[PDB]
């Protein structure tokens, strides 16, 4: 699964009709799942605001 | 195709005359084209302002 | 060793109980240890505030 | 050649005396040298302020 | 979802009992899903052998 | 533009019919276009065989 | 901690005496520690030969 | 400074005459200079053959 950063492009697809946007994704490299105790409350509290 | 982030360098080329700048590019890794429905209006509306 | 950037996810672990957060890490690629003289005072003074 | 982003660490070296800082570097991947005409004046004018 | 390349490490976990291996993963950056027609039969036939 | 390395996955698309393969791409980071003189004949001769 | 792939360079250090080699490291991005059950015996058996 | 892996492309430059090849470079990320003692003789002996 992944989360989108921003949009950096716009084009027309192969069908010649549909509009496609170029989506920048957060790298899932340099990303791990860790138990709630290993993380600092701060970063979590910032995630909750998002 | 690619989009430029910023300039982080300045030098003289091999001809000994022309000025070259060092351009940082957005990685086209972690980037996909997706149909207009898969994207959130927000990120698009931010792209339109750019 | 590594340093955490932010939290970009939340899930339940394999035990079906514990809460896990998805932690983005700074890449340790593009990172070297250098003696105190090679670094500019500025970047250090910014690190001290962190 | 390379340019430093920030400092994200501090340690003591192998000699047991000297202080070392952990320097994050801009990736020189996703970076090319391009002639002054290919670049937008804007990004250059931002580089000049740096 | 992800696919494992190889094992490059071995350690003992935080419980002090369980054995953990360090798994190298294929980057899911530089990876896209594409319809069967866009791909060459060859690469597919190589995948089928895997 | 890009060049395919291998196939590392297989799935069914959103339409519920079409077969999609997961294509690993060569990173276009760490890649530059250079004049024929800057390159060694060898690497070129290897490209010609491909 | 890290593991070395190969050597791709050779130079003289800042002291003007010592010989330094340029070491390519496996990225610790795209690498996680996982319990012995999550890994396939094969990859482990290949690690043991190393 | 950098070292070339292979050639993965061929095109005509902007002048409309010169032939350009697309060169894949080893990432200088995940690469450090280390004293001759920190490296294993093996990897060095493999570098000498190159
Ligand atoms: Mg990645
Ligand atoms: Mg890339
Ligand atoms: Mg890395
Ligand atoms: Mg790099």
Author numbering:
A (entry chain A), B (entry chain A), C (entry chain A), D (entry chain A), E (entry chain A), F (entry chain A), ...: 319 to 368
What did the original publication write about this model?
Co-translational targeting of chloroplast-encoded cargo proteins is carried out by cpSRP54 alone, whereas the post-translational cpSRP transport pathway is mediated by cpSRP54 in complex with cpSRP43, a 43-kDa protein that is unique to chloroplasts. CpSRP43 is a modular protein with a unique arrangement of three chromodomains (CD1–3) and four ankyrin repeats (Ank1–4)2425. Chromodomains and ankyrin repeats are versatile protein–protein interaction modules and allow cpSRP43 to participate in numerous, specific interactions with linear motifs. Here we present a detailed structural and biochemical analysis of the cpSRP43 CD2CD3 interaction with A3CT, demonstrating that CD3 binds to a linear motif of A3CT and that LHCP targeting is regulated by a serial connection of ankyrin repeats and chromodomains.
To characterize changes in the conformation and dynamics of CD3 on ligand binding, we also determined the structure of the unliganded CD3 domain by X-ray crystallography and NMR. Both structures are in the open conformation characterized by the unstructured first strand β2a due to the absence of its binding partner. In the crystal structure, the CD3 fold is stabilized by helix swapping between crystallographic neighbours emphasizing the high flexibility of isolated chromodomains. Helix swapping is probably due to crystal packing forces as the NMR structure exhibits a compact monomeric chromodomain fold in solution.
